[PDB]
Every structure is written in structure tokens, then in C-alpha cells.
Amino acid sequence: MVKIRLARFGSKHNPHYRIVVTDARRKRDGKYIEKIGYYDPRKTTPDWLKVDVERARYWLSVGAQPTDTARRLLRQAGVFRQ
Amino acid sequence: PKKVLTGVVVSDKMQKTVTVLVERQFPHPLYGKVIKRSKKYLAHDPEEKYKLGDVVEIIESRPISKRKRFRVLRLVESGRMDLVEKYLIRRQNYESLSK
Amino acid sequence: RNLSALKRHRQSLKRRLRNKAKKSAIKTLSKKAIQLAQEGKAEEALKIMRKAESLIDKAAKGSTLHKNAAARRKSRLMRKVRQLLEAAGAPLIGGG
Amino acid sequence: GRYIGPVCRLCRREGVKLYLKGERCYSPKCAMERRPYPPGQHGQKRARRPSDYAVRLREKQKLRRIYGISERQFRNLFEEASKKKGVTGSVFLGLLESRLDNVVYRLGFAVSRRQARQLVRHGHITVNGRRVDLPSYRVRPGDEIAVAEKSRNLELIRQNLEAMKGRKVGPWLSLDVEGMKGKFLRLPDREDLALPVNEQLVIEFYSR
Amino acid sequence: LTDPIADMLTRIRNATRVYKESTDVPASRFKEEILRILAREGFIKGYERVDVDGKPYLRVYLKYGPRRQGPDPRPEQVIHHIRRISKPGRRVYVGVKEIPRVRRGLGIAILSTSKGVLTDREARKLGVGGELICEVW
Amino acid sequence: PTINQLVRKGREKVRKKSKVPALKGAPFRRGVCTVVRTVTPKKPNSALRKVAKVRLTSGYEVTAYIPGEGHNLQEHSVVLIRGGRVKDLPGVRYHIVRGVYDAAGVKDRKKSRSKYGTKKPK
RNA sequence: GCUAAUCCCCCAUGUGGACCCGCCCCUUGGGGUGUGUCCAAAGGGCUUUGCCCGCUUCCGGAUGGGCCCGCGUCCCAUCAGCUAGUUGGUGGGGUAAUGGCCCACCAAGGCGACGACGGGUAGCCGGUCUGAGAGGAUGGCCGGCCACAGGGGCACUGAGACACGGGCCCCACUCCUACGGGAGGCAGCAGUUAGGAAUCUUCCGCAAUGGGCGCAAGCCUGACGGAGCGACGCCGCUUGGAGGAAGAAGCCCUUCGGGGUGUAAACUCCUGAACCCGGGACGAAACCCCCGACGAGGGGACUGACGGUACCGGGGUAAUAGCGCCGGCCAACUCCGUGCCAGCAGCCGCGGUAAUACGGAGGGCGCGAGCGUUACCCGGAUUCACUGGGCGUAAAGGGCGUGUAGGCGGCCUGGGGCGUCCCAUGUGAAAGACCACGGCUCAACCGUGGGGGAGCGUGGGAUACGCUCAGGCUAGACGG
RNA sequence: CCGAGGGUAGGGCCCGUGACUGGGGCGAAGUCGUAACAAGGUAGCUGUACCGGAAGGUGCGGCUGGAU
Numbered sequence A: 001m002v003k004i005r006l007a008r009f010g011s012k013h014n015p016h017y018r019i020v021v022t023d024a025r026r027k028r029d030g031k032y033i034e035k036i037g038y039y040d041p042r043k044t045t046p047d048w049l050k051v052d053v054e055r056a057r058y059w060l061s062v063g064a065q066p067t068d069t070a071r072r073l074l075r076q077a078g079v080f081r082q
Numbered sequence B: 001p002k003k004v005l006t007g008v009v010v011s012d013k014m015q016k017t018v019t020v021l022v023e024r025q026f027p028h029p030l031y032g033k034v035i036k037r038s039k040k041y042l043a044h045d046p047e048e049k050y051k052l053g054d055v056v057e058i059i060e061s062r063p064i065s066k067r068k069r070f071r072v073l074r075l076v077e078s079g080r081m082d083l084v085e086k087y088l089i090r091r092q093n094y095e096s097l098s099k
Numbered sequence C: 001r002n003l004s005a006l007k008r009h010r011q012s013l014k015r016r017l018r019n020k021a022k023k024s025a026i027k028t029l030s031k032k033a034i035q036l037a038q039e040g041k042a043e044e045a046l047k048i049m050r051k052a053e054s055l056i057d058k059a060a061k062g063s064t065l066h067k068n069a070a071a072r073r074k075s076r077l078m079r080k081v082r083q084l085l086e087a088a089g090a091p092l093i094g095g096g
Numbered sequence D: 001g002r003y004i005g006p007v008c009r010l011c012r013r014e015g016v017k018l019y020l021k022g023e024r025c026y027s028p029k030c031a032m033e034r035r036p037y038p039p040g041q042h043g044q045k046r047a048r049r050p051s052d053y054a055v056r057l058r059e060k061q062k063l064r065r066i067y068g069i070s071e072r073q074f075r076n077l078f079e080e081a082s083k084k085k086g087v088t089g090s091v092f093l094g095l096l097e098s099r100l101d102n103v104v105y106r107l108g109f110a111v112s113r114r115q116a117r118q119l120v121r122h123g124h125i126t127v128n129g130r131r132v133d134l135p136s137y138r139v140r141p142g143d144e145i146a147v148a149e150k151s152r153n154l155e156l157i158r159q160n161l162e163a164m165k166g167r168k169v170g171p172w173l174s175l176d177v178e179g180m181k182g183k184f185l186r187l188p189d190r191e192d193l194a195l196p197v198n199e200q201l202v203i204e205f206y207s208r
Numbered sequence E: 001l002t003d004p005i006a007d008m009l010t011r012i013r014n015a016t017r018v019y020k021e022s023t024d025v026p027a028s029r030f031k032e033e034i035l036r037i038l039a040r041e042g043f044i045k046g047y048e049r050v051d052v053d054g055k056p057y058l059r060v061y062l063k064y065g066p067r068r069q070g071p072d073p074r075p076e077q078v079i080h081h082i083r084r085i086s087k088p089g090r091r092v093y094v095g096v097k098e099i100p101r102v103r104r105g106l107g108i109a110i111l112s113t114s115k116g117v118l119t120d121r122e123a124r125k126l127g128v129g130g131e132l133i134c135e136v137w
Numbered sequence F: 001p002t003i004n005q006l007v008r009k010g011r012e013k014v015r016k017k018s019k020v021p022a023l024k025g026a027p028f029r030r031g032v033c034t035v036v037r038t039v040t041p042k043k044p045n046s047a048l049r050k051v052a053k054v055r056l057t058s059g060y061e062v063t064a065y066i067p068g069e070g071h072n073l074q075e076h077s078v079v080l081i082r083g084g085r086v087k088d089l090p091g092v093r094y095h096i097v098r099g100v101y102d103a104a105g106v107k108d109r110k111k112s113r114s115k116y117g118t119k120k121p122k
Numbered sequence G: 001g002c003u004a005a006u007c008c009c010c011c012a013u014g015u016g017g018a019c020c021c022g023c024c025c026c027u028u029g030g031g032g033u034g035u036g037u038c039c040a041a042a043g044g045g046c047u048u049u050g051c052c053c054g055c056u057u058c059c060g061g062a063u064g065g066g067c068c069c070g071c072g073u074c075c076c077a078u079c080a081g082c083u084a085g086u087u088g089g090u091g092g093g094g095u096a097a098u099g100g101c102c103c104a105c106c107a108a109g110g111c112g113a114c115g116a117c118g119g120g121u122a123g124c125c126g127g128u129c130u131g132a133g134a135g136g137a138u139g140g141c142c143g144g145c146c147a148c149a150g151g152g153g154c155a156c157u158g159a160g161a162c163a164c165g166g167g168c169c170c171c172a173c174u175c176c177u178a179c180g181g182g183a184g185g186c187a188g189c190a191g192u193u194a195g196g197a198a199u200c201u202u203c204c205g206c207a208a209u210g211g212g213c214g215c216a217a218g219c220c221u222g223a224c225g226g227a228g229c230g231a232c233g234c235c236g237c238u239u240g241g242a243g244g245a246a247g248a249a250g251c252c253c254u255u256c257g258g259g260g261u262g263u264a265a266a267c268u269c270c271u272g273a274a275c276c277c278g279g280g281a282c283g284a285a286a287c288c289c290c291c292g293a294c295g296a297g298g299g300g301a302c303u304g305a306c307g308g309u310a311c312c313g314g315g316g317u318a319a320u321a322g323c324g325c326c327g328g329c330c331a332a333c334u335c336c337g338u339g340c341c342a343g344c345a346g347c348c349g350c351g352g353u354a355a356u357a358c359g360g361a362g363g364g365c366g367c368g369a370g371c372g373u374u375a376c377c378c379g380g381a382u383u384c385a386c387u388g389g390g391c392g393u394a395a396a397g398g399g400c401g402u403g404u405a406g407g408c409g410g411c412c413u414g415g416g417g418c419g420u421c422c423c424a425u426g427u428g429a430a431a432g433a434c435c436a437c438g439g440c441u442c443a444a445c446c447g448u449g450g451g452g453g454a455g456c457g458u459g460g461g462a463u464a465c466g467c468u469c470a471g472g473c474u475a476g477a478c479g480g
Numbered sequence H: 001c002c003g004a005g006g007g008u009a010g011g012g013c014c015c016g017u018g019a020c021u022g023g024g025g026c027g028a029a030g031u032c033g034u035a036a037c038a039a040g041g042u043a044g045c046u047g048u049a050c051c052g053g054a055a056g057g058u059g060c061g062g063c064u065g066g067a068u
């Protein structure tokens, strides 16, 4: 199944994720279908999170399944707010 | 789209199959000169209606045999036994290239 | 030294028999319908051909046949039975 | 790390006063005043015509030894300036002067860049309120280099700042004395820094 | 004769090197357009369609600099350098983005485009490439 | 050549013949001495140069120079070798590394100790 | 021998789907419809005439694949001829599906100097190193694709495998054994051994991210997140700062007057790597639970391997420097010792009693936790020359014709628009590279944003040049 | 039926090695003569042929890159 998840980039003790859609059988940091945001768990920048909701809601439409702490961050951007 | 090539029929000694010599040009990727290159395609002639010396068009096609991935699309010109001889003269010269 | 792989193997052997048994029966009745139709005997040919068709689609219910594979056997079966009876005629029952 | 041995021999070798010690650099017991010839057994022998390689090596060793910087860091800065669009000579000197340990010396917090480095390395310096103990920091325009207030009651830094009272700094700088803080205005020019150095000869040394 | 275009450029070069006032090249429309560029840019005084023993020619009128002083009075050439680029044995075509600047602007590259024969400046102002015929300065 | 000849034939890239075949792609090769003797050099030099014939692990037997004043190598001495000829002993293409395996460093050496494999003296 | 089920089977139901034949549309097997024939199923748990987890048939989506095609992809022609499932046809078998993929028959074909066949070498690419560019070299780490899982063959199960830690068989090898017989497959993580010039801990944790299963709690995860060792690479940092004699001693040189090491040391003040004590993270809030409605939304909670680590605060000791080189190229010179010896050497060359070239010393130059050496790649090498070379005597015109293929080709007109040129558009993944900003105190490293390119697909346009087709010409060529 | 492979037989290519043998490169401190460079003491070189301890000689034809 297609999934929306966090491909870790960055470096050691400095994680920087790309909120991303890819086949679940890929490896974590492998070729993704498309990128739809980034995430900085350390909050050390004036926008440690971003989400293209126009696309993030499309992938939910065609049935992508968000990870748990991906949905938690897709929530903080309001993809679910009705 | 399906690839379409033009060339002359150089043999038709096969049942429902003709051999289309196809030519092309391009600049040599280091010495610039425009050079010629040719290649033969085994073409599906399901009506045995194309003849030696005909110039035809072939279109990339669902595989027919082992070496057959092109059917003949349409006739372009007939009676080109001048081109067919250039191909044959060369092949004949090969015997003079042995030991 | 062990695995749930052992479990997976014991199951493949049980499934192996069910698949082979079904395909055995399908093959037999397919040529039986074909052979009957050759000397057709149209009522008896189509009679069996209906039973071959049921076993085919029953095979493609589960993991024994694929849709297109079952559909393919059916086609060539009916194609062979009709064009055999049509050498003498004429088909009593259906189909079709 | 950095060079640590005798520093007067450097000037005496380069044939020019490099102001590397602070106030003895201005006394009459400066070595250049007493023996302005190269160090070692043959210092007083008549020099031979130096090769163009010699000439260019010397100018580069001058500019380098001035900042007491390693050839490694020196060459990386030159290679940074060399890629940068614009004249490489200017940018090179500009990047050199933008080093924290250099600015601290320019502000008169220390008599010598060596002293500045032991100041910076000992955290006795801050940049925009952030304590920074790194000599290599590239100070940018609009910054602010103060004394660590938890060090402002220190003899050496006070006596130094006393002699800076009303003293001019480069145009590209400004020193709030009494408050022990300075400001980096913009990165300086060849005009602002009259260094006893034709920096163009350093471009040529590295093009070989 | 395998290359009339390079033969003409060579007819001009041999003539200018011994300071002849004119030389005759056998005529052709593609040559006229080439000489049309050399006159309009001042590498030649011009030309005229003349006739040598009943054959259609082009008489090209050369121009040189002022007489010089010293040991060598020979005046400086106006066509210092002219050579064929694209040749029968190797065609040379450039796109508009890869047209060259002869002699840092002080020279012309003559092109054959599908808007006719142009200079490197003309071809760049019309946004077209073509066959790089030769270069002059 | 014409442009057509270059389309027909191309330009020949010429490979570089190694001057150290016995190393077989390695920076060094371990070996065992067979003959340890002195050889005289070519004109215009005169000397008794110290050489060892080495039977290598790469499957080669080669002559290698023994640098420095004095050594301790004998038949069955285990040595390491590196590239480098002796302009002046034809056939000698390699050098024994002092201070490795059974090659002792040069005794009393003071300048250039990393070559000649001599520890810093107190 | 007994028994359960979401296990297997049978019957019904046929929304629908499958197949045959007919017809319509279409155009390779795409869609539609008519008769016949054929095919569905599984329940479980709660807060129980309602929910949730499941199950069945069908259409569609999305994602991931299979197959096919154009073009590109190394060395040897001292490999020049190769080919019987070979090349095509018909029919069948087989598959998810095209195909000699497999089989039977029929025909005599297929391929090659534009290099078949054979031999050698190699996983390929994004990229990487170098280079002014062109080019040359390379494909380790990360990303993508491919291939393999001791050597072979094989199928089974399955949506998917001909399956690294699944099965069968053969072989090589090893082990256990009670001697009757059995077992094994680290090119997973560590680790051992062998080989080698040479390459790591039998570490910690699922806290994060990700995967499988589960309604959920949660379980499993040598993926992974981290810690360990190696100067292996890059980056940052220290071994102190200031003052301090016409200038200690020691050592070196000396014309014996003196010169050098050298502000260097001593010494004085000042700072305070390390170490001590106190505090101490970010990475972590979702899943969950409460209200709402199990949604939207709002509340509440558990949880950190790294780690008592970074980092903060307070205290606080002057606290490792080494390596190469100094004839020329190439930056740095003297004394002794040696005397074609011992030795040096990248090339040219040094050494035979006054050696800036050997060996030490003093001094000097260059770098610095590095400095040298060896190996290999690109550069200098326009020294394989496309950019960008040559062949009278330096290496280089075939002994001379004739002529095959090929390469190349005069003047004018028109048609086509193949090359060629322009515009639009799709593709050109991510990382990297590049400019900018930002985050780790800087940097290295890393994050965010920006700019395109060739090349190829498609659409539209141009016609000078080359090409092609047609017509005409006589200056080339050929005949009288 | 096909079939891993095993067996029998006969071919092709490549590598390592071999009594002995052929010449080659280098060494240099030897023995023999002195063929070439001067008209190099018989102008030289050359294809071929025959011959001689050796450099080389001679025949036949060719070249001048031969002094006077």
C-alpha cells in the first residue's frame, strides 16, 4: 500500500525528516513517489514543519495510509480539519 | 508513440516476411562529420504483397516471431533495384575479404 | 534450529494435492468432451463440456487457477468442441 | 596547531617589520631596529638575486605569518576567495580580516593577534551576546564583539582598553570603549588595510 | 573542384596577399550573398557580375590600409584572416546559443540560416542558428 | 589524417607499462631473501652496492636494493619491498623497506630517519 | 481411533463476472449487446433490531511489476566468416501475457568489414576524481536498476519466488553419533581462521524513524537509532599570552676582533587545555484514554538507548612536537668526518684528501598531529592533436597502375523538408554540484529555497546549406 | 520425453613447466683484427646470391645520402 511517512535525512544527532509518499516496501530513505513536506523535531528554525495540503489530501484520497506520527504532523497542518 | 521507419525490402525469400533495410544519419559524436548507418528489420508481410526493391514503412508492433517486431505499414515506392544492388554488391565483396 | 517455516511447508504439501487433483480432473473431462465431440455424440459431448466448465471456474475460485487461465482453457475447449461437432453436426444441447 | 616559536626571526627573515608582539614592536629593542638581516649563521652575507618563485613564496609567507594562520586554513580561505565571483585579491584579505581573533586584535582588546587568540580561545570574548571561543569565526557585518562581562574586571583587558581610549580603529570598525564592545561595520578594502604586501603576488604563487 | 566556397575565400586570400585591386571568382547565388556580407561589413569595396570569355563570374574589389613607413611599406590588410569552417568533409552547424564571437566582437562569422546568409550578430538578433560557413577579420 | 579516416579508425589510446610488475597492483609486497650479496654499479660509478634477491608472495623472484649504511639481512630474512629503481644497478627495480619484518633500521642514523626506519633517539 | 474452525467440499442465489457463437461500434486480443453454458461466500467481538473487525462477486483508482521496441554502452581482426530451433510459415502446448518460449510439420532461410562468430576484461547508471574546456580516468561510501545466496538442476506453495536464514535431487566439503545412523550452508550483525601491504566491537537500545502481525494493548525487528576501536579522510582545537639583555650558559662558526642560535631561555606578571564539584537537555507526542460521535475538534496521560552525554554554572593546573628537506629544477649553507670507499639518486648527476650532492653537527627552509615514502588515476603531455600535431633530409607517402565498397562532388529552377535551425510542450527522481539564506559557538557536516542544461518523445514553424526527386545548362569530364 | 551430471572417445584454445638449443639485452676491468665516420686508406649504402674466425668480401643491378 502507498504510505505517507518520514524519510530521515539530515545527519547524526541532527535528524531532519521529509514527509513523503512512497511504497511501503521501499527502504526508509529510498526512492519516494513524491515529497509533501519536511519536519524538524528539534524546532530549531522559524518553520520546523511544512505540508502541501493540496497534495497531502490527494494522497489520502487515492488511499495513502499515513504513519502514526506522520498523521500527528499532518494534523498540526490541518489536513483533517473539516 | 509506435516507432515508424522507412527502408527498402532487400529479401522476400520468407513466407509472410520481408527484410527491410533501414538507414539513418547522425553527426559523429566526436569528429562531427555526418555519418551513415544501416540496420535490417524482419517485417511482417501477412499478405506476401511486398516485393524486392520496394520502399516501405514499418511500425513497431507486438512481437510476431523471434526477430519480428515490425509489420509493414504502407508502400512508399516501388522498383528500387538500385538500392537493393548496393546491399548485394557489398555482401558479394565479403568473399574477397577472407583467408 | 527451527522456524514457522516448517509450518509453511506442511501447508504447501496439503495445498499441492488439492491443486493437482483439481487440474487432473479438469484435464480428463476436457479431453473427454473433446474426444466425444470428435465422434459427436453432441448431446454427450456438450454434457461433459458443461462439467469441465464448472470444474475450471471452481478451480479459479481459489489459488488453483487464475481468471485468465481458467478463461483460456474454457475458450479452447469450446472452440475445439464446436469445430469438431461442426465436422458432422448438429449440436443438440447448449451452449451456446 | 598555530606557530609558537620565536617571532622576531620571522620579521628578520621577511625584511619588514611585522607587528607581532605589541609594544616591543615599537621600542628600540625591536630586533628589526638592531639586526635587520635574516636569522641564522649567514644572515649578514650578501643576498643573491632571488628567483621569481622565491619572491612569490616570500610575499605569501609575509601575508600568512602576519595573521599567524596555518598554511591549511590560509590556503582554504584563498581557495574560497578564488571561486567567489569578483577580484580574488580583495576577497582574500576581506575574509582574512573577518576572523574573530583578528577583529578582537583590531578592536585593541589585545596587543597581538596571538594574544587575541588566547583571549578568544578562553571565552573572554562574545559575539552578539553569544560567547564564542573560536578564532576561525567569520564575523559578518552588523555583529558586535564585546568582552565577556564575566571577564570585564580583568587587568590585561582593562590596561589594553585604557590605551584604546579615543584611539581610532579602521573605518570598517567602531569601538564603544568604557563599555568594552565593538562593532563590525563592513568587510574592509585594500585601501583600509595598508599591509606591507602585494597580494597579487600571492595569486601568482598559487597558480603555478 | 570540390568546394567553391572555400575556393572563393582562397581566391580572395591569395589576391589580398599580393595587393591586387580585384580578382575574378566564378559566380553563384550563394557566393553573391557571401560577398554581399563582406562589402556591407567593409572587408571589400564590393563586386559586380562580370563575364570572362562568355562565363558568369564575380569581380571582387579589395581594399587595404594606408601605405606604411619604414622597411616594409606594404599596407596592412583589411582582411587579415578568412578561413572555411564547415567543409564538405565535415559539416559544422551551431544553434543560436552556440554561435561564436569572432575576435571578441571585432570579427564576423558568416552563417547560412533558413533566413539566408547572416553574420553572427545578425543571427543572434534573429535568434536563429545555421551552418557556420567561415570567419573573417 | 582526414576526418573520414578518424571516423574509420579513431585515435589510439596508449596504455602505461608499469615499472613495478612484481608488486601486482600493491604498494608493497612481502618476500624472502634468497641471495644476499653486493653488486658493482654501471659506469661511471664505482662501488659495492648491497642487494638481496627476494622470493615474493606475488609469485616473483626479484632483486631489491638495501638502502642505508650496513644491514642485517641474510638468506631466509623476511623483508618488505617497495617500488624504486637504482638508476645504476640494471635489473634492480625495488627497494627493501628498512624497519619492517626482518630488515633492521640503520644504526646510529640521525637525519631522514623515517626512510631507513630508525626510531627517534633519546 | 476421535473432534473444531475464518479448514475443505456440495446446493442455492447471479448484482455482476467468465467462455462459446451472432450483430453494432472500434481497430492487433478495446468497448457494447443477444441466446446458452459456467462461477460467489466466513465468521468473530462488543456497550446487542445497532456498531466495529473480518468474508464474496464486480467496476474503478493508486502503487508495484512482467514483456516488447529506437538509440547508447570496453580491448584483440595475429578471432573472418557464423548459424539445424538455426531464419520464417502453419498448427498446437504454455503463460498474467506477446514470442522458437516449447513441440510437430512445411519452406530455405537468418547474421557479418556499419566487425558477425570467437578470445580477453567488466555488474550498468545518478555520479566521483581530474581537466581552461574538449576530453581522460573511475563506479567504493549514499540513491536507482540488475545478478547472485557453497557448486548445479528443479519445481511446489503463493497476488508475488523458481525463494539468503523454505522444499527436492546431484556434487564438493565439514561435523555429530550410542557406529544403527544423522546434520550443516555468515556474499545478514558481530566474531574466528586462511590469504594479504591492509581494513573494526562476539557493544547498547527498540527511546526515535521504518517494516510485519494485531480492533487494541502490544509483540518482533543486528532494518535502524546510537555507542566501541583505527590520524583512514576532512573540519575545528591545544601544547600558552605579555614583558623580558646590545644579548646568560651550552653548542656552532671565526680573520680570534667577533658572528650565530636569540626574546629564544631564565625571570616577572597575566590568562587557565585539562582535571574537580553543582545543575543538566533537545531529540517526545502521537498510538492511548475522557468529552465530542471511535470523525472534525478539544482536553489528559505513559515513554530516552545514546546519557548524567553534550551543554550551563562554579572552581582550577603553563600544560605533548614531530616529520621532510637545504647541488640544479626547488625555498633553505657552513664546519668536521670520509677519500670512486662508505654512501646518495625523481631526472640531470654527486663521491678518487678543502664534497653547499655521502655521514654527523650548527644553522636554515617548508609543513605541523602530523610529515614523508611506495602504488595507482587525471594534469602538466597540442606526447593519439574533435577543440589541438604531423610524414623532402628529424619517426612517417603505399614500388606503380587499375578498379570494388565507401567518403567527397559544377552552374540555374522548382517540389518534398531527411539532416540543419527556431518556438511550445513532456521527460530529464532523490542525493551530489552550483548561488543564497539558515542550524550545530565556527567549520566539516547538515537543513530550506533558487537557476538551468544537454539528450530523447510530441506539436507547430523556417528552407539558405547539405540530402532527396524533377526539369534545364556547359565552364568539369568524356567523345567527334 | 526432457533432464543436473557422471562415463567413453576424439578435437580446439590458453597457461605453467622441460634435457638441450638459438640468438638478444646489459656488464666491463680481457683476446682478435679494424668494418663505418676524412677519398676512413678498396667511395659509401643497398636488394639478392655465394663465401669467410670476426667485423666483412665478392658477383649482379640500383641510389648519391660520394671526396678530388
Ligand code: SF4
Pocket (backbone or CB within 6 Å): D007, D008, D009, D011, D012, D017, D018, D019, D020, D021, D022, D024, D025, D026, D029, D030, D031, D032, D033
Ligand atoms: S619586535 Fe620587531 S622584529 Fe620582533 S616581532 Fe616586533 S616588529 Fe617583529
Ligand SMILES: [Mg+2]
Pocket (backbone or CB within 6 Å): B064, B065
Ligand atoms: Mg508467429
Ligand SMILES: [Mg+2]
Pocket (backbone or CB within 6 Å): C004, C007
Ligand atoms: Mg505462523
Ligand SMILES: [Mg+2]
Pocket (backbone or CB within 6 Å): C028
Ligand atoms: Mg487420467
Ligand SMILES: [Mg+2]
Pocket (backbone or CB within 6 Å): C059, C060, C061, C062, C063, C064, C065, C066, C067
Ligand atoms: Mg484464483
Ligand SMILES: [Mg+2]
Pocket (backbone or CB within 6 Å): C063, C064
Ligand atoms: Mg500456484
Ligand SMILES: [Mg+2]
Pocket (backbone or CB within 6 Å): D019
Ligand atoms: Mg599593524
Ligand SMILES: [Mg+2]
Pocket (backbone or CB within 6 Å): D081, D082, D083, D084, D085, D086, D087, D088
Ligand atoms: Mg575570480
Ligand SMILES: [Mg+2]
Pocket (backbone or CB within 6 Å): D169, D170, D171, D192, D193
Ligand atoms: Mg586605517
Ligand SMILES: [Mg+2]
Pocket (backbone or CB within 6 Å): D192, D193, D194, D195
Ligand atoms: Mg593595514
Ligand SMILES: [Mg+2]
Pocket (backbone or CB within 6 Å): D206, D207, D208
Ligand atoms: Mg592550478
Ligand SMILES: [Mg+2]
Pocket (backbone or CB within 6 Å): E085
Ligand atoms: Mg573546426
Ligand SMILES: [Mg+2]
Pocket (backbone or CB within 6 Å): F044, F045, F046, G340
Ligand atoms: Mg662516479
Ligand SMILES: [Mg+2]
Pocket (backbone or CB within 6 Å): F031, F032, F055, F056, F057
Ligand atoms: Mg614466500
Ligand SMILES: [Mg+2]
Pocket (backbone or CB within 6 Å): F074, F076, F077
Ligand atoms: Mg634469520
Ligand SMILES: [Mg+2]
Pocket (backbone or CB within 6 Å): F111, F112, F113, G324
Ligand atoms: Mg630528515
